[PDB]
């Protein structure tokens, strides 16, 4: 059985570096090119770069060529990837991919491994729930959980589609001028809470939570409230 | 009367420059902080930069800090985001809000503007119809990969099942892979590619993909969601 075993992602800072590796067993790593395919989270499948031993050929994405580096040991059947100037953007899973024999003149990616999750973040607000569908005149009540202790530095938004960002609900609780009082806020510390009493058309849209207290003032998710 | 206005936004190829413009009235531009705030394509909210023309200070999210650059021009009463080095991530709505005056602890954006719409995209291409579908057991699915360039049947298909590795399916178009089921079929030439699921099973419920097989970047389709 043809198997290939990618390792090395994890949890890294901005500008830091990662080494992918890719073991291959069940055939011979020579003669076969090996290929880096990426999935950001919620995206489709992007080509990174490509390697075949026995002909000495490496290639590139374009968008990598400077800062990624592809490479092999043949002893070990491993293939590698180095990543340098890591950014937020290069947060995905990361998979390699068998490609053609080097005898051969046909490139599918016919053998692929499990993934390995790499990401790149500073480490706040986990908004709930995600979506949720209400009818009218229903109450609703949306969570906002913070990572840290906020007081009660948290703010509220609404956005209908199409639309900018409205403010709600400032310092947790406070109701901001020409909202409606159908509206309440509450909690402090990490638990914080908006509650509709009663939902009206106007209502269907996407809620956020937001730290207010320092940079970079996190957004939570959002929760989108859809009608049933 | 306090209004913002957002312009400068466009469609750029990546690697290019936009100068956003936030146009602020009906209030003491100099005394409060102006921010800018964007939102990529169905997704949340996210803090840019800050400016503060009275206490002298500005703030960037570590994101953009040495892309991203904020001023103002007090004669004007608006603030400016030039962004330099864009990248397809960067496409996103971008508005700026005013959060709290120069002596205020708190943070929270209290007037927003429209937004302007910032693309990021070259404007080789790989489009896949329909982007998702509902079906039943049993049913036919019909996808459609659609190439802005000849091929010469140099397509394959790929299955990734939820979290999981993509697996080939069908390679130089027709070709079906060893071990792949039957029920499955590619065909199709030139520009134009398509594939049949004849009798859909609770194991085919995935994201498929069409490929360029040759030459790099091995572009791949957006994806067809398959679900029940």
């Known amino acids: 059985e043809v198997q290939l075993v990618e390792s090395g992602g994890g949890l890294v800072q901005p500008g830091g570096s990662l080494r992918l590796s890719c073991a291959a067993s069940?055939?011979?790593?020579?003669?076969?090119?090996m290929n880096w395919v990426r999935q950001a989270p919620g995206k489709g499948l992007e080509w990174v770069a490509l390697?075949?031993?026995?002909?000495?050929?490496?290639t590139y994405n374009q968008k990598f060529k400077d800062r990624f580096t592809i490479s092999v040991d043949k002893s070990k059947n491993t293939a590698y990837l180095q990543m340098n100037s890591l950014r937020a953007e290069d947060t995905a899973v990361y998979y390699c991919a068998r490609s053609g024999y080097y005898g051969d003149s046909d490139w599918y990616f016919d053998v692929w491994g499990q993934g390995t999750l790499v990401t790149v973040s500073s480490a706040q607000m986990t908004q709930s729930p995600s979506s949720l569908s209400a009818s009218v005149g229903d109450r609703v009540t949306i969570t906002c959980?913070?990572?840290?202790?906020?007081?009660?530095?948290?703010?509220?938004y609404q956005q209908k589609p199409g639309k900018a960002p409205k403010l709600?609900?400032?310092?947790?609780?406070?109701?901001?001028s020409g909202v409606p009082s159908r509206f309440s806020g509450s909690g402090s510390g990490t638990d914080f809470t908006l509650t509709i009493s009663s939902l009206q058309p106007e209502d269907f849209a996407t809620?956020?939570?937001?730290?207010?207290?320092?940079?970079?003032?996190?957004?939570?998710?959002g929760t989108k409230v859809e009608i049933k | 009367e306090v209004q913002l206005v957002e312009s400068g936004g466009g469609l750029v190829q990546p690697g290019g420059s936009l100068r956003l413009s936030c146009?602020?009235?009906?209030?003491?531009?100099?005394?409060?902080?102006?921010?800018?705030v964007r939102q990529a394509p169905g997704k949340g909210l996210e803090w840019?930069?800050?400016?503060?023309?009275?206490?002298?200070?500005?703030?960037?999210?570590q994101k953009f800090k040495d892309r991203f650059t904020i001023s103002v021009d007090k004669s004007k009463n608006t603030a400016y985001l030039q962004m330099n080095s864009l990248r397809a991530e960067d496409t996103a709505v971008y508005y700026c809000a005013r959060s709290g005056y120069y002596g205020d602890s708190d943070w929270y954006f209290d007037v927003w503007g429209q937004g302007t719409l910032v693309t990021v995209s070259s404007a080789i291409q790989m489009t896949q119809s329909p982007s998702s579908l509902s079906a039943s057991v049993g049913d036919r699915v019909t996808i459609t990969c659609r190439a802005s360039?000849?091929?010469?049947?140099?397509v394959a298909w790929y299955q990734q099942k939820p979290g999981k590795a993509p697996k080939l399916l069908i390679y130089?178009?027709?070709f079906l892979y060893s071990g792949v089921p039957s029920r499955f079929s590619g065909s199709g030439s030139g520009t134009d590619f398509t594939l049949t699921i004849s009798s859909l099973q609770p194991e085919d419920f995935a994201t498929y993909y069409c490929?360029?097989?040759?030459?790099?970047?091995?572009?791949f389709g957006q994806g067809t969601k398959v679900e029940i």
């Open positions: 490929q360029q097989s040759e030459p790099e970047p091995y572009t």
């Open positions: 360039q000849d091929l010469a049947t140099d």
């Open positions: 390697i075949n031993p026995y002909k000495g050929v490496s």
């Open positions: 069940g055939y011979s790593f020579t003669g076969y090119t």
């Open positions: 130089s178009a027709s």
